[model samples]
Target: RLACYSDPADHYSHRVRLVLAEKGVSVQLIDVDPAHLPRKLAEVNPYGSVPTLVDRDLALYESTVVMEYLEERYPHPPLMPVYPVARGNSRLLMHRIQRDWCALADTVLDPRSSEAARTEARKALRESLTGVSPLFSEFACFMSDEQSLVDCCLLPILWRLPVLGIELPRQAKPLLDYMERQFAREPFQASLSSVEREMR
Candidate 1:
């Protein structure tokens, strides 16, 4: 069994948790406060962070690497696409998300951010999502039915947006359609911890 050092509320930690759930891999979650990390988590990751994955002698601390590793490790219910082009698109989506959305999402997710920052982020997120349209419409689910690594990366963010007061625009019906399916999807729902389910 694997052990995940996480915080249910931490966005990065939530990202990894969703991947684990999507992969159907049972893990022992050692949820912790970001400020006061456990000795065990600190020992494995010098940065002393949640979202660290421990398996035997291997310890992976970054969410991006951890997700890729899981896809390769358990290639069964594959989350990434098979084609090189589709894979590139999936990877690109994840990168663009972190690069673009994270700044705004952090405003809502991170309490340390100011109210003004949160408001600005909310605005930016809406604009960003509204721009996503037929470009994101070329697939069954974020490119294809395989779910893709992109979806795994996206699941947590899209789910939180509504709660954060950021909703996708009708102008982007493809994205809107995608979000609707995600809420009802088994894997996405499974990714939520009981408390998070209540939060929804």
Candidate 2:
């Protein structure tokens, strides 16, 4: 049996859930409270991050790594491209998201940040979005008209931005439209709706 330890509201957890849905895989979901994550999931992953996947005897942590494993293990209806260069580019896109956006998101969302600190954080976030524009523009045309690994990486953040009060630039309209189209797809609609319901 496949089991995933995660919090439904977490962006990282949403990323993993999107991949599993895209691949048409069913796995048990164990939701964890962010505050008690270390106690709940530490045995499975020392870092105790949400979205830990346990497949029979194998345990996987880290959302990107889990997505890669799923792509490799179940290649039909491939989320990643078969060509080496395209696959490499896909990974590069994921890396930029992790480094430029995910890292900053974690910091900005930290509850301990003071109001002034949050203001600075928002400014930094706007700057990061500027950096993201070029990278997203370069590859937005290549995303699967349906769903792809790039969608898996980018959609979760887009989903969370509204809640965070982060405004995507006007130039980012194409990417935003792409993500909305994916969210409406059958594979993603349920999970995406679930996230929004949890927020309300």
Candidate 3:
């Protein structure tokens, strides 16, 4: 059996949870507060990060690392593409998402951020999403025919759009459609923490 220490509301934690659910891997999800972490978590993860996955002797932190581990370990309903070139492209897409969207989303969601900063970030995020809306229509998943790790990295952020104070306009209909379809998945629904369920 495996156990995961996760923050109920954080997107990073949600990312790992989504992967676990998608893989149908049963895990004991321990919800923890970020500000006051548990001693057990500190022992496993040096920085006491949420989404620390403990699998027997292995203790893995970082959502990407955890997700990759699960993908390799389970080897069922693979989240990454099979071909090397396609896999590399998916990895690049995930990287770009972290660099572009996640940064803005973090800024918008940070309580400590100034109103101006949040506003700017929110605007940027909205515009960027809208800008890329058409790309979503090309495939059932994020730029891929099959759902990949890129979708796992992205869906959590999309789920938090309301809380992030982002409302995709009519122009982003393709993206809005993508959200509607993906969010309706049983695995994605199962992945949501109680706090996250209340987000919409």
Candidate 4:
């Protein structure tokens, strides 16, 4: 069995957990303090981030990479599509979530940030969402069938948004609905709610 070193509340960790659950791979989770991350993470990844995977002699870092590894190793319930264009779009959606949405969410959700700073962050978040709404609407259509890599990448953030009082704009209704449907799945319900309860 693989072991994952992570923080339960960390969004990055949650992303990896969702992928592992979807792959039906059971793992031992080692919750580490941000101030005192395991030395193995530093040895594997100099940046020392959470959700590092330890599989036998292999140590992998980064949420997306971990997910890709699972897909390659498991390959039963495919996350990325078989078609090249669809696969590229799925990867693009993951990149967008990592590069844009996560940063916007961090500014508002990081407890160390001041209230005024958070308010300004919230404004930036809203503006960022406004910029991405049209693009996301187009991407939502790409995910009309079963849950794909895009939903795997985006659903955790969507779940966390309401906790921070962030609502998807009217134009983003399809994407929002897609997220709700994806999250209601057995794998997601198992991972998300259990981890959320552990955090509380």
Candidate 3 residues 15-112, lDDT tens each? 99999999998899999998898999898889888799997799998888888998899988999998899889988999999989999999988889
In terms of lDDT, which candidate is stronger, 1 or 4? 1
**Candidate topping lDDT:** 3
Report the alpha-carbon TM-score of model 1 versus the true structure.
Answer: 0.89
Question: Candidate 2: worst 10 consecutive residues by lDDT?
Answer: 137-146
Error of 1 at 22 (Å): 2.0
Lowest lDDT block of 10, candidate 4: 135-144
| Reference-based lDDT, each prediction | 0.80, 0.72, 0.91, 0.74
Mind giving the per-residue lDDT tens digits that candidate 2 earns over 92-197?
9778778877776767778887777667766777767655555444544334343577777767766777666687677776566665665677767645536555
lDDT of 4 by residue, 39-76 (tens): 76788778888789888889888788888888888897
Tens-place lDDT per residue, model 1, 123-151, is: 98888878765756787776566677777
Better of 1 and 3 by TM-score: 3
* Highest TM-score against the true fold, candidate: 3
lDDT of 1 at 116: 90
TM-score of each predicted structure versus truth: 0.89, 0.82, 0.98, 0.81
Task: Itemize residue pairs with steric clashes in candidate 3.
Answer: none
**Every model: Cα RMSD to truth:** 1.9, 3.0, 0.9, 3.2
- Candidate 3, residue 1: how far the Cα is off, in Å: 1.8
